[PDB]
Amino acid sequence: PRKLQDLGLKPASVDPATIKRQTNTHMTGILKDYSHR
Amino acid sequence: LLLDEHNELMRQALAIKDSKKRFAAIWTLCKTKMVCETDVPSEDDPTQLVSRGGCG
Amino acid sequence: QFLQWCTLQPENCAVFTSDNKEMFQTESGLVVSTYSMVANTRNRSHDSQKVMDFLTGREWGFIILDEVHVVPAAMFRRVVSTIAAHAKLGLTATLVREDDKIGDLNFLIGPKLYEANWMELSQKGHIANVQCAEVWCPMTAEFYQEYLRETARKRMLLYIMNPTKFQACQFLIQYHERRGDKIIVFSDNVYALQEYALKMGKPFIYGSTPQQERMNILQNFQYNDQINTIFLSKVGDTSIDLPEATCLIQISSHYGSRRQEAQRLGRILRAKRRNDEGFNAFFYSLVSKDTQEMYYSTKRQAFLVDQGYAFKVITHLHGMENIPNLAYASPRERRELLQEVLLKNHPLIRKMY
Amino acid sequence: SLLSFDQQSPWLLRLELDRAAMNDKDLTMGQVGERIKQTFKNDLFVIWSEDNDEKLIIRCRVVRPKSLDAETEAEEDHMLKKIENTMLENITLRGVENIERVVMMK
Ligand SMILES: [Mg+2]
Ligand SMILES: [Zn+2]
């Protein structure tokens, strides 16, 4: 890819060096988890 | 390089004149780094991180 | 609330609480803490010591003291002199307290700029209307006998747990629950709170409860229809928002404090439907007759009367007898409860060891 | 008679020192007794005979704590065999470490 870019032609790829791999218990069993709204 | 100039320990290592001992110091510091550290804490303070060329 | 109402970016906001102790590093930011985290002087944690230095080192430009009715205390006043700030603001719904230190606020933070009426906002739809009531529960004969001989400290528990109050609370809860009303039951006594909660199988909250458990309880009550009533305590006496609450009840009280009376009422004053036609919130105050509670009741409700609130005397609750079952209906249970409540008062040698 | 002792262990460690040896180097049982007493400050009781005695003997007793360890009784004697070995090797009565012997020459 670098060789093509230096000669003018746009390369359809990139060097693989650029890729960046990225209390109360009686209520037990009754309360539903309304964590979000 | 796994460790850049942003580390104080690396700064002193790079200040060594003779090549043979400079390489040994760098190897000791760098051989224990197991990650590229794409982002490194800024040298001015450790609050914000300054981005450096890396891949994580 | 900060985040929702203004355009403050999250990056510039830092919360200084017991859970997390990371401070903003931006040039300007916001630290929201409590007096205990700024007024404590003797024992601060290593994690909390750096934050205190972080707060002290920088020169703040503005301080917002929520509930400024606690600053004139013996030690909280120290913060106003230590921390640096070019302007000071005080926020409190009630500006009264038992002692005379309230007047000291003039030279502590400054004068009182503005105050707003209660009834004026009620009639304009800004706050809900309340049908304040005062229920007189006669003392049962058996308990009242011990009331005379017993001392003041134990007398309180004696007339706060009379069986008649148990019956009234159960009937009111059932009647109001079928009416689709979210009820709040206040009780300063933790022992009564647990006994009432366990007897009726409803959640209760007080000081020892962890933050995670109470948050789950609050969210369930807010959004889960199964939990329509709760049992709050002195912890929830103020600064907790329950937009769904419409009805309010109180069993115990912290003697004659008129401020606690106003703060507790505030839980239902911010109800969701405060503008629908004919909306009237309810506040019931069960009190034992011929006890020191009348002294405390009329003494702790003299501030609301000044605002404009009027309490309705309920000598009889209609339809209370026809309820199928009532707690402590038989003398045997009353006697059992009476006794239960009455009884309340060389390095190598290291291996050896 | 000249004189706590209630909780002293019944197992006794006895050391027999040579009369000649303690005379080759100027030593007395009082100083060495304190040397043992300072290696372990107050975790064991020691009594030492006098120079006039025909035989030089040191008696040591380990004192157990208030809490009772039912499991240590099996190894109680073994522990004594441990400390005595370390009391023979890791004790510096006097001198500088790594100094084996000294000879006088004129
Ligand atoms: Mg508030
Ligand atoms: Zn890399």
UniProtKB/Swiss-Prot annotation, chain A:
Signal peptide, first to last residue: none
Residue ranges of the TM segments: none
Compartments where found: Nucleus
Function comment: Recruits TFIIH to the initiation complex and stimulates the RNA polymerase II C-terminal domain kinase and DNA-dependent ATPase activities of TFIIH. Both TFIIH and TFIIE are required for promoter clearance by RNA polymerase.
Other noteworthy facts: Present with 1150 molecules/cell in log phase SD medium.
Subunit structure: TFIIE is a tetramer of two alpha (TFA1) and two beta (TFA2) subunits.
Family: Belongs to the TFIIE beta subunit family.
Protein name: Transcription initiation factor IIE subunit beta
Encoding gene per record: TFA2
From Swiss-Prot, chain C:
Impact after mutating residue 67 to Q: Loss of DNA translocase function of TFHII
Variant or mutagenesis effect after changing residue 5 to L: In suppressor mutant
Domain of life: Eukaryota
GO BP term, pick one: transcription initiation at RNA polymerase II promoter
Gene ablation phenotype (knockout): Essential, it cannot be deleted; epistasis studies suggest it is involved in damaged DNA excision repair.
Role summary: ATP-dependent DNA translocase. Component of the general transcription and DNA repair factor IIH (TFIIH) core complex. When complexed to CDK-activating kinase (CAK), involved in RNA transcription by RNA polymerase II. May have 3'-5' helicase activity alone, the TFIIH core however has no 3'-5' helicase activity. Also involved in transcription-coupled nucleotide excision repair (NER) of damaged DNA. In NER, TFIIH acts by opening DNA around the lesion to allow the excision of the damaged oligonucleotide and its replacement by a new DNA fragment.
Subunit structure: Component of the 7-subunit TFIIH core complex composed of XPB/SSL2, XPD/RAD3, SSL1, TFB1, TFB2, TFB4 and TFB5, which is active in NER. The core complex associates with the 3-subunit CTD-kinase module TFIIK composed of CCL1, KIN28 and TFB3 to form the 10-subunit holoenzyme (holo-TFIIH) active in transcription. An additionnal subunit, TFB6, plays a role in the dissociation of the SSL2 helicase from TFIIH after transcription initiation. Interacts directly with TFB6.
Extra facts: Present with 825 molecules/cell in log phase SD medium.
The name this protein goes by in its record: General transcription and DNA repair factor IIH helicase/translocase subunit XPB/SSL2
Region of the whole protein represented: 423 to 837 of 843
From Swiss-Prot, chain D:
Post-translational modifications reported in the UniProt record: The tandem 7 residues repeats in the C-terminal domain (CTD) can be highly phosphorylated. The phosphorylation activates Pol II. Phosphorylation occurs mainly at residues 'Ser-2' and 'Ser-5' of the heptapeptide repeat. The phosphorylated form of Pol II appears to carry, on average, one phosphate per repeat. The phosphorylation state is believed to result from the balanced action of site-specific CTD kinases and phosphatases, and a 'CTD code' that specifies the position of Pol II within the transcription cycle has been proposed.
Assembly information from the UniProt record: Component of the RNA polymerase II (Pol II) complex consisting of 12 subunits. Interacts with DEF1; the interaction is direct and serves to bridge RPB1 to the Elongin complex in a DNA-damaged dependent manner. Interacts with the Elongin subunit ELA1. Interacts with the Elongin subunit ELC1. Interacts with ASK10. Interacts with ESS1. Interacts with RTT103. Interacts with SHE2.
Linked residues for Glycyl lysine isopeptide (Lys-Gly) (interchain with G-Cter in ubiquitin): 66
Similarity section: Belongs to the RNA polymerase beta' chain family.
Organism: Saccharomyces cerevisiae (strain ATCC 204508 / S288c) (Baker's yeast)
Domain of life: Eukaryota
Protein name: DNA-directed RNA polymerase II subunit RPB1
Compartments where found: Nucleus
Domain notes: The C-terminal domain (CTD) serves as a platform for assembly of factors that regulate transcription initiation, elongation, termination and mRNA processing.
